[PDB]
Amino acid sequence: PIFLNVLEAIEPGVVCAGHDNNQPDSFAALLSSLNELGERQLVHVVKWAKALPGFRNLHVDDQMAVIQYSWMGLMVFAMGWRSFTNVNSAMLYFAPDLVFNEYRMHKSRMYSQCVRMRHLSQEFGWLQITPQEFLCMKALLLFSIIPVDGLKNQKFFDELRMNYIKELDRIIASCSRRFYQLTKLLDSVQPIARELHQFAFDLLIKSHMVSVDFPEMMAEIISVQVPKILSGKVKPIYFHTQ
């Protein structure tokens, strides 16, 4: 069962938002925590992906690129399991010190996107998603977005992604019934990802004025890589069209 042994052995721990939970729910303080959370949770993807089954098979620029793009989609997906598993999907469990309530959902001005995330979190439920199914969908999520001109080696990449399906396909395996659903969920992700990608970007521009603090690396990714996606340069690979 070697493939699985790895996903869990590499699987990150609990990251904290490092949040002064005493300060009342201000749009600035909330989002100046999510930015650190983005940052911290990014460090952890950097490390997690580096250790993936045949990740160093890819080009080093491609490695960075795929991480830089995926970063969001993953954080969302993982976050939704976090909420699902820890709060039974009642609230948004970003970190231990940053669980999002209706009022906090509202106070970050991210309400719609949170409805979406409570939603997909609700899906782990309604779909009896196994951890070994979750883990696999998350690994595969890294390979779910590329530039349209293609990677420094698309070949070695397509190779990688293709074997991450056969893997989930083996983890599932009238199996086709299940398959669909999971590929469906794995799509619901990108739509949302792109919404935060847009939310985050709006913010970065006006952050000077809304008093919301982006870490150096946060701003950079949002300033240089996220625009690629938003500008349609970089598009995610959906299973079904849509």
């Binding site: 460090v43 490695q63 960075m64 150096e216 690396m217 950079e220 990714i221 240089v224």
Partner: peptide, 9 residues
């Protein structure tokens, strides 16, 4: 910038 630096630590 700072990401590629994080990719050699």
């Amino acid at each position: 910038y700072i990401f590629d630096l994080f990719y050699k630590r």
